[PDB]
Design a protein around this nucleic acid. Structure first.
Length: 102
DNA sequence: CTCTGTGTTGAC
DNA sequence: TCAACACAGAG
């Protein structure tokens, strides 16, 4: 009945078998949403930590070796709140697509 | 009604 | 900074 833990950083079990994501900023936990797939929570955490802590931060799936790309552009052109809301609303990929329609 | 995500606590 | 766990209260 104890919930399963995640290999990945910032990912927690949700009681229904789903997964939640969270980033810590100072003393405060910032919820990043809930997700059906553990990998999806992990990816959301990666996006959030690149926006909160920069291109050289430790990710679940990301390189650390790409300093200046379109993702850094899209993240820098948006507030922290807007990225968190995109992740919680599952709209990040769509917004990034329409952004680089430029 | 369902079930997120906040409150809280304790390791590190 | 971080997650584990219970369950207030958001939707």
């Amino acid at each position: 009945r104890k919930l399963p833990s995640s290999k990945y950083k910032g990912v927690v079990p949700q009681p229904n078998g789903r997964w939640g994501a969270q980033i810590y900023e100072k003393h405060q936990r910032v919820w990043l949403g809930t997700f059906n797939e553990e990998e999806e929570a992990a990816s959301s955490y990666d996006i959030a930590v690149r926006r909160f802590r920069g291109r050289d931060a430790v990710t679940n799936f990301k390189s650390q070796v790409d300093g200046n790309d379109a993702e850094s552009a899209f993240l820098d052109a948006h507030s922290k709140a807007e990225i968190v809301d995109m992740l919680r609303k599952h709209t990040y990929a769509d917004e990034f697509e329409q952004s680089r329609r430029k």
